[PDB]
Design a binder for this molecule. Structure first.
Ligand SMILES: CCCCCCCC/C=C/CCCCCCCC(=O)OC[C@H](O)CO
Ligand SMILES: CCCCCCCC/C=C\CCCCCCCC(=O)OC[C@H](O)CO
Ligand SMILES: *C(=O)CCCCCCCCCCCCCCC
Lengths: 183, 128, 183, 49
């Protein structure tokens, strides 16, 4: 159907844009040292979630590993922006939602698989918001910082995930209305 | 001791400031963890001297030596050696302010989906 | 999306929609709610009420934090000071100030026993980077380029001349500090 | 305050929404400016020269 084609495309799109977001290293555009004896560094660097690579300087494309642990209670944040479980939990959920949609087009009659997808997309978009907030709220703790296309993919992925969630619920409603009609 | 004053500044979360000579202040400003700073102008202007007991015969020669070392540039070289050559130190609201409201919100949206999918499970298992 | 879901996904409620909270009527309740502007529809289930209760609290804090920060800006700006006398200069540190080298103005400050001018000299003589300039032109440039963070002490004749030169961005403020002449 | 009618069409709901946003910014800018007027009293404007 038309409502299904969009769901497949939307599930794929959301999952693709979030996987690229979690992997690419252009989340933030800030000023920082792209290398592990005073060093005249402070060169323009682009950072993702785990790697920071400077945009310019004698180290044109040298990368590094972010050090996320540089006293209590707050720590819990430093450890949620260091595993990045919320961005990664959002990838897993979107993948699981796709399985549901795909499984739906095979078994059929089940109806509750189509719903499950709806719960795995809406929650995926909800994990994403928490990951976005945690990201921003951690950098602030530590300027002309600007955001890159990996941030705006994770923002665009959220939008596509919520819309597929609406669409998947709208298909679940329609499946059940067809049952009530025959009754 | 000066070291105790430095520690008190460093450990007191901004609630202690230490009055000390600019020389010591400037030295510490270039030591790790580079968390202190000299602020304001100096309150007075003075100097350190080499001291001898009153009337000691050593005083005259020591004084001429200080002048010779000054004029040869050696005192400046020594200050740079020990202070600088060896230095170790080289509004709108933000989401941080309202982080909580956003969490609470996403926690009540996940609590609603739990209180709604649970009821759904019951009513469905009952119809069996 | 979550309001839409919690309300209409469950078919046990349908008999005809049980609530009017369709995705569209949910994007409208949520909008109204945020703008404090009340609406006509209101959730009637436990689920749909945990989505309007945490959103009314969110809305409340965000609107209160906009009014209370717009009222902090408008106030602090209302406390701005013109800084137009030597006494004003002497009592603050944000705005640096200095004199020409090797002339009578610098000597005036160096020798003054007047408290305000002595205070100014004590600051100027130890300020870093240097607040003194080698030529009047350099002092003018420093005023013009420093975004209000440098003021220049110079003879009224030179001051008045520059006040009539493009780009007409400087001004003499306060009375003269002394009275003398060129010979 | 509240009324007894809320637009139920897309066209009508855009007008309602851009006007509830306008309203919000202006009622906040009045309370916030009024607060600045009562917190810091300047009250100085006679002969100056
Ligand atoms: C049909 C049910 C849904 C109805 C929906 C009705 C929508 C009405 C819009 C409301 C607020 C609009 C706010 C617009 C804010 C614009 C911000 C802007 O222009 O910002 C420019 C720039 O990015 C700054 O840095
Ligand atoms: C009929 C059903 C009606 C609707 C029912 C749901 C509405 C919930 C509304 C507000 C929640 C506010 C939660 C506030 C959380 C405060 C957290 C707290 O206690 O923080 C302590 C602090 O961290 C120490 O330093
Ligand atoms: C029947 O028993 C099914 C309901 C029980 C499982 C509910 C699982 C979903 C819970 C709500 C969604 C939470 C999203 C959190 C996002 C960070």
């Amino acid at each position: 159907g038309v409502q299904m084609l969009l769901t497949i495309v939307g599930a794929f799109a959301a999952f693709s844009l979030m996987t690229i977001a979690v992997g690419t290293d252009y989340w933030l555009y800030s000023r920082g040292v792209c290398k592990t004896s005073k060093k005249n560094e402070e060169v323009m660097t682009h950072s993702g979630l785990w790697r920071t690579c400077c945009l310019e300087g004698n180290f044109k494309g040298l990368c590094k590993q972010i050090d996320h642990f540089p006293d209590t209670a707050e720590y819990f944040l430093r450890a949620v922006r260091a595993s990045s479980i919320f961005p990664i939990l959002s990838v897993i959920l979107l993948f699981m939602g796709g399985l549901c949609i795909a499984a739906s087009e095979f078994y059929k009659t089940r109806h509750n698989i189509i719903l499950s997808a709806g719960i795995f997309f809406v929650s995926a978009g909800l994990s994403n918001i928490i990951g976005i907030i945690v990201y921003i709220s951690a950098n602030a703790g530590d300027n002309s910082y600007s955001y890159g296309w990996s941030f705006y993919f994770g923002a665009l992925s959220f939008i596509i995930a919520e819309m597929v969630g609406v669409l998947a619920v709208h298909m679940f409603i329609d499946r059940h209305k067809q049952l009530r009609a025959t009754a | 001791t000066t070291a105790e004053g430095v520690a008190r500044v460093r450990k007191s979360k901004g609630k202690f400031a230490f009055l000390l000579e600019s020389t010591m202040n400037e030295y510490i400003e270039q030591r790790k963890p580079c968390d202190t700073m000299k602020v304001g102008g100096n309150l007075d202007s003075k100097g350190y001297g080499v001291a001898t007991p009153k009337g000691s015969s050593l005083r005259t020669p020591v004084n001429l030596a200080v002048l010779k070392l000054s004029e040869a540039g050696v005192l400046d070289k020594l200050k740079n050696k020990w202070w600088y050559d060896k230095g170790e130190c080289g509004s709108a609201l933000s989401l941080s302010n309202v982080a909580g409201v956003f969490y609470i919100l996403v926690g009540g949206l996940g609590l609603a989906m739990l209180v709604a999918l649970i009821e759904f499970c019951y009513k469905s298992r009952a119809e069996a | 999306v979550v309001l839409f879901l919690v309300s209409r996904f469950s078919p046990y409620e349908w008999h005809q929609p049980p609530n009017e909270f369709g995705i569209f009527n949910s994007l409208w309740f949520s909008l109204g709610a945020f703008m404090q502007q009340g609406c006509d529809i209101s959730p009637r289930s436990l689920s749909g009420r945990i989505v309007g209760g945490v959103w009314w609290f969110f809305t409340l804090i965000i609107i209160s934090s906009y009014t209370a920060n717009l009222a902090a800006f408008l106030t602090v700006e209302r406390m701005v000071s013109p800084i137009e006398s030597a006494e004003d200069l002497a009592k603050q540190t944000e705005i640096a100030y200095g004199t020409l080298d090797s002339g009578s103005t610098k000597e005036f400050f160096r020798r003054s026993k007047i408290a305000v001018y002595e205070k100014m000299w004590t600051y100027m003589r130890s300020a870093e980077p240097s607040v003194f300039t080698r030529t009047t032109a350099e002092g003018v440039a420093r005023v013009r380029k420093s975004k209000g963070k440098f003021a220049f002490l110079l003879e009224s004749t030179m001051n008045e001349y520059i006040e009539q030169r493009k780009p007409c961005d400087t001004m003499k403020v306060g009375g003269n500090l002394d009275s003398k002449g060129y010979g």
